[PDB]
């Protein structure tokens, strides 16, 4: 007969290091080539399994593939990937459902950090917070001397990150840190103290 994808490979994400694989089963195929962006994958790195099926009687091959950074680096940051099933001559190539492969990533450093300062009772604190380049967007949590900081009446979390604090009380003194928590990695800034005096 001829031959038909019995499952296609999925779209997914490169987190920190870990690999996506790929997956990839033909019908009455020999052989499974898989290409990202304009570019054959070595056999040498494709895990193929090939069989037949004991109540059909139908040659099979399932194929799997490790997507790792170092892939999306030599390659947008989207780049798009699918198998081909080969076989005899008269056989004629079938491609699959192209997978797009996206990469989730976080920088080494902040790109605005937190500085202490002394401010006066009463005045309007800001501690401000960027997190470094990560895709997807980091979540950015404040601390306070080991707490979380719970926005309230007095402290807002505004949305450029920035920790805001409408009337400063003496309460209001701590050690702070931003973290950024991103898919791929979680990074704290440098605790910085902040002292209100009256
Ligand atoms: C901001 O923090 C400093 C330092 O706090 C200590 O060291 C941190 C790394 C962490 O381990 C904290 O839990 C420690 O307490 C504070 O200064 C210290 O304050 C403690 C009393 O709370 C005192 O025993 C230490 O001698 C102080 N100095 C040092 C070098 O530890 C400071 O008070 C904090 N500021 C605010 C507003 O909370």
Avoid at 6 to 14: F, H, M, W
Avoid at 27 to 51: M, P, V
Wanted: aromatic share 6%; hydrophobic share 30%; net charge negative.
């Amino acid at each position: 007969d001829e031959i038909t994808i019995t499952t296609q490979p999925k779209s997914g994400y490169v987190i920190r290091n870990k690999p996506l694989r790929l997956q990839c089963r033909a019908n009455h195929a020999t052989k499974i080539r898989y290409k990202c962006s304009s570019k054959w994958i070595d056999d040498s790195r494709i895990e193929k399994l090939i069989g037949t099926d004991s109540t059909s009687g139908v040659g099979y091959i399932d194929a799997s593939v490790d997507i790792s950074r170092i892939d999306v680096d030599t390659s947008v940051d989207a780049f798009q990937c699918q198998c081909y099933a080969s076989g005899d001559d008269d056989q004629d190539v079938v491609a699959s459902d192209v997978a797009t492969v996206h990469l989730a990533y976080m920088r080494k450093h902040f790109l605005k950090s937190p500085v202490a300062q002394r401010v006066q009772e009463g005045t309007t604190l800001q501690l401000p917070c960027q997190a470094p380049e990560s895709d997807p967007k980091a979540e950015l949590t404040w601390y306070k001397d080991g707490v979380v900081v719970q926005p309230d009446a007095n402290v807002i979390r505004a949305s450029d990150g920035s920790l805001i604090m409408s009337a400063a009380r003496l309460s209001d003194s701590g050690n702070y840190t931003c973290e950024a928590t991103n898919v791929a990695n979680s990074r704290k800034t440098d605790p910085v103290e902040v002292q209100i005096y009256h």
